[PDB]
Structures are given as C-alpha cells and as structure tokens.
C-alpha cells in the first residue's frame, strides 16, 4: 500500500489500539494521531493523508459534523468510522433531531410499548 | 389518554402492524396513515398530530431528511423512528457521507482488517 492514515479519537488507549492494529496488518507507512478536530483539520492541511479513522465523540466537537465539512470541501480523504455511537446516538446526539425512540425492524410487541411509554414520560 | 398519531411508512403491511400494535395498547382516538412524505406533510398542515411514527426509506424521499425539515420548521411533533436502517444507512444512504465502513465499539481483532480491506478495494 504505502499510504497515510490519520487517527482521530479522544481516548488515548483506543488511539493506541488503532495504532497497534494498523501495524498488525502493517501495509502503511505513516500513522498520525489527533485527539481533536482542530488538530485533525490542521494535520490534513499540513501532511497529505489518504484515509482517516474517525470517532463521533471528540473533546472539541462532533465527528459527524466534521465529516460533513470534509465532504463539503471535497477532500481527497477516505473516511472509515470507528465509534461507540448507535443509530439512536446519530439522530439525537449527532444530528440533534430529538427523536423519542429508534425502533429497529424487526421488533417484538414488548419493545413497541416500551417505545410508547417513552412518549408518555415526556 | 386521547392523543393523535400519524404513521408514515411506504409498505402497507408494516403500516397495518403499527396500527394493530397501537390499538393493542389503545391510548389513542385516531391513527393516520401515510405512504409518502408528501401525504404526511399535507396531513401535518391539516389535522392535529402529537406523535409521528416515521420510517426512513419512503417512496418520495428520505425519512431523516423529512425529520430535518420538520425541526427546521419547528413543528409541535414527537417523532419516533421505526426503521430497518442501521448506522451505516444513516451515514451513507441518508446523509451521503461516502464512509468506507462503520465499526461499532467494541470491535473484534479480525473485524478491524475487514474494515481496512474495504478501503483496499477503493
């Protein structure tokens, strides 16, 4: 390969885990670390990077918003998300849309009324 | 007791299931049906609706896009997403963000390289 990878992740242990794993395949030369979006933006403008490993919860901002920006400016960067956030998190915490509950299909009857009683509590 | 619901789902079977399940609790007077965003919007301007059971893959557009407009217009409405779409679908199909992969934390030793292999083939 011989390609550049930027890791953007808040927790330094998981940063080390991506670092370790990428060298355990080890096709790639330079591996950059960043704990903030502000660092990541400046690193992209500094050294040319091929792929990016991005989280959603960073210290300074939201990962999904940064990716939105990254596509608007039409960056020569291939992004792959490594994140704890599920569907419910993307809608509420990342898109700020304010959904009561995210029902996954297929669903059981008990899960449906669980999602209905969540409305009543609001 | 006594509240309004609009179902917006493109397939009429799952529409009947939502209807059947809402009555199998039954806190509600009227339950409205819709197969498009267009039919839903017109109902929202028309009759009083408290909560909305919204899908993502609708006939005339994307449910997440309809939700975004619904909040930018600031509608007095309680969305509850009932959908088969995962995180990857919200990022790429619903937000068009051209992501290579989505690893849900925590990830396996091996699933990391599969996610990298999806970069190697692009």
Residue numbers in the entry:
A (entry chain B), B (entry chain A): 0 to 121
Paper text:
MaeK and MaeR exert their function by activating the expression of L-malate catabolic genes (maeP and maeE) and the expression of their own genes upon the presence of L-malate in the medium. Structural and phylogenetic analyses show that L. casei MaeKR proteins belong to the citrate family of TCS, as well as the characterized DcuSR and CitAB TCS. We also solved the crystal structure of the REC domain of MaeR in its activated state as well as the structure of a mutant version defective in the phosphoacceptor Asp. Altogether, our analysis has revealed that MaeKR is a non-canonical TCS conserved in Lactobacillales and that the structure of MaeR acknowledges the α4β5α5-swapped dimers as a new class of dimerization for RRs.
